[PDB]
Design an enzyme around this catalytic site. Structure first.
Site, PDB file in Angstrom:
ATOM      1  N   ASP A  13       0.785  -1.246   0.000  1.00  0.00           N
ATOM      2  CA  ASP A  13       0.000   0.000   0.000  1.00  0.00           C
ATOM      3  C   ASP A  13       0.804   1.276   0.000  1.00  0.00           C
ATOM      4  O   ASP A  13       0.250   2.346   0.244  1.00  0.00           O
ATOM      5  CB  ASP A  13      -0.892   0.090   1.251  1.00  0.00           C
ATOM      6  CG  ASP A  13      -1.990  -0.960   1.291  1.00  0.00           C
ATOM      7  OD1 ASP A  13      -2.501  -1.376   0.209  1.00  0.00           O
ATOM      8  OD2 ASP A  13      -2.346  -1.352   2.443  1.00  0.00           O
ATOM      9  N   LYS A  16       3.089   2.351  -5.079  1.00  0.00           N
ATOM     10  CA  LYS A  16       4.238   2.327  -5.980  1.00  0.00           C
ATOM     11  C   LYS A  16       3.843   2.580  -7.442  1.00  0.00           C
ATOM     12  O   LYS A  16       4.685   2.970  -8.261  1.00  0.00           O
ATOM     13  CB  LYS A  16       5.018   0.998  -5.825  1.00  0.00           C
ATOM     14  CG  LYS A  16       4.130  -0.253  -5.680  1.00  0.00           C
ATOM     15  CD  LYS A  16       4.931  -1.466  -5.233  1.00  0.00           C
ATOM     16  CE  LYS A  16       4.051  -2.522  -4.558  1.00  0.00           C
ATOM     17  NZ  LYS A  16       3.580  -2.165  -3.175  1.00  0.00           N
ATOM     18  N   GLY A  40      -1.564  -6.169  -8.588  1.00  0.00           N
ATOM     19  CA  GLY A  40      -2.536  -5.090  -8.601  1.00  0.00           C
ATOM     20  C   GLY A  40      -2.149  -3.719  -9.146  1.00  0.00           C
ATOM     21  O   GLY A  40      -2.461  -2.711  -8.509  1.00  0.00           O
ATOM     22  N   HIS A  41      -1.457  -3.639 -10.283  1.00  0.00           N
ATOM     23  CA  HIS A  41      -1.133  -2.316 -10.813  1.00  0.00           C
ATOM     24  C   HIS A  41      -2.421  -1.919 -11.542  1.00  0.00           C
ATOM     25  O   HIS A  41      -2.983  -2.691 -12.355  1.00  0.00           O
ATOM     26  CB  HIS A  41       0.089  -2.354 -11.752  1.00  0.00           C
ATOM     27  CG  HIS A  41       0.691  -1.004 -12.040  1.00  0.00           C
ATOM     28  ND1 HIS A  41       0.066  -0.103 -12.867  1.00  0.00           N
ATOM     29  CD2 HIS A  41       1.927  -0.533 -11.727  1.00  0.00           C
ATOM     30  CE1 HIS A  41       0.930   0.882 -13.052  1.00  0.00           C
ATOM     31  NE2 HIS A  41       2.068   0.673 -12.387  1.00  0.00           N
ATOM     32  N   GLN A 224       5.565  -6.813  -3.990  1.00  0.00           N
ATOM     33  CA  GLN A 224       4.964  -6.762  -2.649  1.00  0.00           C
ATOM     34  C   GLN A 224       5.847  -6.045  -1.660  1.00  0.00           C
ATOM     35  O   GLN A 224       6.951  -5.651  -2.014  1.00  0.00           O
ATOM     36  CB  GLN A 224       4.589  -8.154  -2.142  1.00  0.00           C
ATOM     37  CG  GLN A 224       3.384  -8.742  -2.867  1.00  0.00           C
ATOM     38  CD  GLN A 224       3.610 -10.186  -3.246  1.00  0.00           C
ATOM     39  OE1 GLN A 224       3.983 -10.500  -4.409  1.00  0.00           O
ATOM     40  NE2 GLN A 224       3.448 -11.084  -2.260  1.00  0.00           N
TER      41      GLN A 224
END
EC number: 6.3.4.4
Lengths: 431, 431
Positions: A13, A16, A40-41, A224
């Site tokens: 979170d 990035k 999750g981009h 991550q």
């Protein structure tokens, strides 16, 4: 530095995304070196907000090549899925995407083991998209697994497959009491796409070395958070795999001494999803304030996302793990409109002593008590500023302190979602 | 180079033993970062051969501290056995050695699992040394395992132990048809040395980071050859851990950029144990010469070691992956007496292409043909020579050639077992 590694220094979170998108303007190559389909981009393409978990974001830039390194665990399914969405949106992924033949495969049998290992030897679970990553990794280590290169010899894949599948099925039905996986559905599902997967194949470590000699710019993309590192993180509450910078070499094939610059993505205040230790947590009005203003109820979401003052003890631990060179401080504004700001600088163990180094994973995490250093806040704004001068003197003093305590310089100050809302003090590639 | 890394650049048995005990002398800290109790250090305590398989050889020296990085897999019975063995001879082990908490533990069912995977293949047993090494890695990445840390909380230990033992005993008795390992025994065995292990635990990241900023000399030591790497060597003819230098940051918790010099331990010719590709392997008397001249016989089975000329393509691969700084050439005088001597300068593939790069696939290594360059031999003896003068020009040009082909300088030439039969052209700590 021509070789840049981008990664987060907390528990995820850190945000990035915007930064990774920016650096990917000068990058010649963008590389994934660990994790699987859980990056999750988030993207906006042709009026459509899509989310990419596997294919690097650099796949949008015309003159960039996206490479998936041997450290990544691969799902033809997951892959084929994102390939489809992008190609449909006018983007030709198959011509700008390359993969390692050493990447281990995730097939249904693997997924099943995760669910059974979860629902059964647990009770409740959701996951998101991780799914089977842990198993595909265990298969690799025992040496039963199947890599991308096995798909050059279709026959052998077939028998190879049949063996692994029998072992896992014996585990499923007999231990977990769950559905055996039809071996045929999988053979057919993988066979259906082999030829595609094999034509994007390449000798990744040799290319990175050619690139190193030709001067090309390469960005290594971490998926991550540092403290989630299977090995060095806050075990037991830790992720499926190594998250630090030490897996750049292992995961890509590039020699350790060629990593030039490690950008550690830092969020101006801490948060952690799910359980696990978090010494700096807030249980008063400041936390909800933080969660509220910060809008921490989404963006690659989860269950229960707490908040707290920056922990310069854990961030000093991230500095070592990743040999960080510079910070890219994120979401400072959130701390605006406050009277006071604090940053942890020591912890007191359940025995009276105050240590400044994250203690051992086996001491007493919830026992630990935080020694905060106090600093007056700023009443001015910050969301969208593009300069030091026009930045409150009080905020500016939060920075230097973040530097002196970690002993690492902040080089980029992302102030807002848009690209222009950024302050580049040192530029990773030119450093 | 304050932080030095030592390792075999081939498939093992490159002769690291003496370079290690040599540099140990200037080293403040000595570190293990991968593998298990399968190092094989044959040394002499007051005129008695004694093989330390887990405890680093630095333990002999007084001004040294030996560290077992988090990447080594730990078996209590081995370490206990080695300590008593060193203590009985007067080497204060407990006061010169320290462990990491992340160390995965090798217990009875791990060894009991490997035992069976051999019994199930027999004639085609992959052959094993350290027993259990692998099943500890699987257990660690599937997150079901146990670290050295968990001993700190004795109530929870037995709790976890219980679970992971029914998962395994289920496999032992229901798939392998072998005996179940008795839980109470393992708990009782483990609780016995518990006080002893936790007494040695320390913060390896911090400790080394402090050494680095102090400028102390630190030596990292590999246990297996580069080409056996789980990620970059001949799959599946590989080991269960990363063997290259990239595993140093990972199996220690010391960031990548902090590696200064990496020294490749290189044998004058090639050797391999067990199955796997090796195009320079010789099937003539020239082959056997090198077998007998360098005592390349098995130590715990008597088996012979495959031999063949030096392959500079494979070696060149090891340079890429280890961002190799220099070479330590070993066993040259083994070639003393040959009329001609060769160097594989390339591979010729089925289609007719000569490449200076190793193939990827298992099968690909099938059609390759070495393209040799043949040079004059030398009859004079090189054993014990101490200066570069007393070396026949022929050994000179051969040493010269290997450099031209690899780009890496030979910085040390070990001419035999005494400490003094060594040409130090550079000195890794000083460069």
């Amino acid at each position: 530095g021509n070789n840049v590694v981008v990664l987060g220094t907390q528990w995820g979170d850190e945000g990035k995304g915007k930064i990774v998108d920016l650096l990917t303007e000068r990058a010649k190559y963008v590389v994934r070196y660990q994790g699987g389909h859980n990056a999750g981009h988030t993207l906006v393409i042709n009026g459509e907000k899509t989310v990419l978990h596997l294919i690097p974001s650099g796949i949008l830039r015309e003159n960039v090549t996206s490479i998936i390194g041997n450290g990544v665990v691969l799902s033809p399914a997951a892959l084929m899925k994102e390939m489809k969405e992008l190609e449909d949106r006018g983007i030709p992924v198959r011509e700008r995407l390359l993969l390692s033949e050493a990447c281990p495969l995730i097939l249904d049998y693997h997924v099943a083991l995760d669910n059974a290992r979860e629902k059964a030897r647990g009770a409740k679970a959701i996951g998101t998209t991780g799914r089977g990553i842990g198993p595909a990794y265990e298969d690799k280590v025992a040496r039963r697994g199947l890599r991308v290169g096995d798909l050059f010899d279709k026959e052998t894949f077939a028998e190879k497959l049949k063996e692994v599948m029998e072992y896992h099925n014996f585990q499923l039905v007999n231990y977990y009491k769950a559905e055996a996986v039809d071996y045929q559905k999988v053979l057919d599902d993988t066979m259906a796409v082999a030829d595609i997967l094999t034509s994007m194949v390449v000798d990744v470590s040799d290319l990175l070395d050619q690139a190193r000699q030709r001067g090309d710019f390469v960005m290594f993309e971490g998926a991550q958070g540092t403290l989630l590192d299977i090995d060095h993180g806050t075990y037991p509450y830790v992720t499926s795999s190594n998250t630090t910078a030490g897996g750049v070499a292992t995961g890509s094939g590039l020699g350790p001494r060629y990593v030039d610059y490690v950008l550690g993505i830092l969020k101006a205040y801490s948060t952690r999803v799910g359980a696990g230790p978090f010494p700096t947590e807030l249980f008063d009005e400041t936390g909800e304030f933080l969660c509220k203003q910060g809008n921490e109820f989404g963006a690659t979401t989860g269950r229960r996302r707490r908040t707290g003052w920056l922990d310069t003890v854990a961030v000093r631990r991230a500095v070592q793990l990743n040999s960080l060179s510079g910070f890219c401080l994120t979401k400072l504004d959130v701390l605006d409109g406050l009277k006071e700001v604090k940053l942890c600088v020591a912890y007191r163990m359940p025995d009276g002593r105050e240590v400044t180094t994250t203690p051992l994973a086996a001491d007493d995490w919830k026992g630990v008590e935080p020694i905060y250093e106090t600093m007056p806040g700023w009443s001015e704004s910050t969301f969208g500023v593009k300069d030091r001068s026009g930045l409150p003197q009080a905020a500016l003093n939060y920075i230097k302190r973040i530097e002196e305590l970690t002993g690492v310089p902040i080089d980029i100050i992302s102030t807002g979602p848009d690209r222009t809302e950024t302050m580049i003090l040192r530029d990773p590639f030119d450093a």
